[PDB]
Amino acid sequence: DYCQHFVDTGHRPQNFIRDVELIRLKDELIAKSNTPPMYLQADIEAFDIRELTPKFDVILLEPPLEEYYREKCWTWDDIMKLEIDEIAAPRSFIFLWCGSGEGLDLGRVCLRKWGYRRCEDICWIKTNKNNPTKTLDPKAVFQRTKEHCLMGIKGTVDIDLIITEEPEIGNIEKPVEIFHIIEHFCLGRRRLHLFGRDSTIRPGWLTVGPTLTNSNYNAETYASYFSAPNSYLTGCTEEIE
Amino acid sequence: LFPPQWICCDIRYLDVSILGKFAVVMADPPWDILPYGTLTDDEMRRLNIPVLQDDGFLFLWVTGRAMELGRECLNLWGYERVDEIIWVKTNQLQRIIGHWLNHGKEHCLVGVKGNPQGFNQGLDCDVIVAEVRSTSHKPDEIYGMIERLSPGTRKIELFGRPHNVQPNWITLGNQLDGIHLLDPDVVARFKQRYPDGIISK
Numbered sequence: 524d525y526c527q528h529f530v531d532t533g534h535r536p537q538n539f540i541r542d543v544e545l546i547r548l549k550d551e552l553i554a555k556s557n558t559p560p561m562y563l564q565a566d567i568e569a570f571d572i573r574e575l576t577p578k579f580d581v582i583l584l585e586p587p588l589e590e591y592y593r594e595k596c597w598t599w600d601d602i603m604k605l606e607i608d609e610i611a612a613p614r615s616f617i618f619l620w621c622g623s624g625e626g627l628d629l630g631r632v633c634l635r636k637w638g639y640r641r642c643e644d645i646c647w648i649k650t651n652k653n654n655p656t657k658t659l660d661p662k663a664v665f666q667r668t669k670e671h672c673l674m675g676i677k678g679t680v681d682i683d684l685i686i687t688e689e690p691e692i693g694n695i696e697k698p699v700e701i702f703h704i705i706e707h708f709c710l711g712r713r714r715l716h717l718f719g720r721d722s723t724i725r726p727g728w729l730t731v732g733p734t735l736t737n738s739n740y741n742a743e744t745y746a747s748y749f750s751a752p753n754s755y756l757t758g759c760t761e762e763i764e
Numbered sequence: 765l766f767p768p769q770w771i772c773c774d775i776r777y778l779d780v781s782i783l784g785k786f787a788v789v790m791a792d793p794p795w796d797i798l799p800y801g802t803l804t805d806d807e808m809r810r811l812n813i814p815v816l817q818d819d820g821f822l823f824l825w826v827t828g829r830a831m832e833l834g835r836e837c838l839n840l841w842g843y844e845r846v847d848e849i850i851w852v853k854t855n856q857l858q859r860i861i862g863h864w865l866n867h868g869k870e871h872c873l874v875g876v877k878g879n880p881q882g883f884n885q886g887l888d889c890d891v892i893v894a895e896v897r898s899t900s901h902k903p904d905e906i907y908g909m910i911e912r913l914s915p916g917t918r919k920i921e922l923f924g925r926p927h928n929v930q931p932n933w934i935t936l937g938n939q940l941d942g943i944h945l946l947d948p949d950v951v952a953r954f955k956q957r958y959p960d961g962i963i964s965k
């Protein structure tokens with residue numbers, strides 16, 4: 524009984540999970556297929572999203588929820604009004620970080636509002652092996668030790684769990700493992716990360732965010748990486764000669 | 765009456781109003797998403813869950829598309845989803861055991877109704893880690909979590925199997941042995957509503 528044990532010792536049940544065919548060639552294929560990293564500082568509340576082109580095969584959406592700051596926040600009100608479907612390809616994927624509270628419901632309303640159906644629910648379980656006590660949201664019945672990243676599809680190897688140790692108070696980063704889960708899906712090469720930061724910029728990805736300190740985005744340069752004969756690459760095959 | 769009690773019946777047709785009020789309801793519905801006896805989505809929507817509680821909590825296991833459907837039923841029945849439990853399925857070595865990702869977990873929505881009072885919110889955390897028993901079985905730790913949250917209270921499980929009977933719980937399911945009831949007021953309202961022991965229309 525790890526739930527009685529956490530009630531005893533403050534060690535969350537996930538503290539005790541162990542281990543938390545080698546075909547890492549797919550990692551190299553992803554890496555050779557990856558467009559140079561591109562990034563653009565932009566205030567997304569005030570930013571006409573349609574200026575971002577072409578349409579994206581993957582959108583990763585990491586809005587700064589008020590609950591990430593326990594000790595500008597975006598409300599689910601603001602998020603729901605983002606015109607995500609105006610920049611998503613007709614067949615495309617979304618990965619949306621919903622937190623652990625109302626987001627688990629409001630983020631499903633977003634996925635449907637923008638045209639997706641949820642096919643995966645990916646949980647970031649946070650261990651506290653390095654500090655066995657936390658203050659609760661008023662509505663909470665239990666202690667919240669996880670965050671949810673909802674996966675949505677519109678149109679025609681990995682587990683659904685990420686286990687890392689709870690980040691330091693006021694660190695809002697999400698585990699880089701999410702990027703590995705996305706890239707191993709091989710969903711295409713137009714990959715957009717809204718509300719990324721300097722710290723998340725990454726090959727194969729376009730990052731847009733208020734806090735970026737530099738930009739290099741140019742829509743014509745960016746669309747050039749996908750012009751024929753590279754328009755349909757999964758991101759997991761060889762670059763065409 | 766503290767010790768286990770159960771009622772073999774079809775939960776669609778039983779008159780749950782005879783059972784009184786409960787501080788916790790738990791349900792592991794057989795969503796149509798068939799290897800056992802399934803229920804259509806309207807049948808699920810129509811279950812008379814709202815009569816079972818005035819204030820308290822609902823625990824609602826979900827999978828696949830019931831993850832959205834169960835959010836619907838939970839709101840339709842008058843609840844607010846205020847938490848969500850996941851059970852991480854391990855082996856005996858405590859390593860981890862939906863066409864896009866393999867599924868290392870199962871979800872349980874937590875709903876609140878009314879203004880429940882005198883519960884111990886915060887005692888457990890929203891993650892259960894436990895080994896898989898038979899197929900289709902919830903882990904037993906959920907009852908310990910639920911007891912720590914609402915000790916001594918009347919709890920009712922919908923769609924239990926015989927391995928689910930528990931002290932302080934009344935289990936309803938169609939594969940249970942007969943009708944075993946010890947709470948006096950319940951035995952009363954049962955005899956009044958069913959003077960012949962058949963649950964029909």
Ligand SMILES: CNc1cc(N2CCC3(CC2)CN(c2ccc(CN4CCC(C)(C)CC4)c(F)c2)CC(=O)N3)ncn1
Pocket residue numbers: 773774775776792793794795800801802803825826827870899900901902903923924925936937938939
């Ligand atoms: C026709 N109306 C009925 C019907 C009925 N029962 C029908 C279903 C009942 C019990 C009696 C449960 N059933 C069942 C349910 C849910 C799931 C899925 N969850 C499994 C556990 C989890 C992984 C934690 C979350 C998912 C499952 F695998 C099996 C199996 C069974 O055989 N019986 N009782 C009264 N009226």
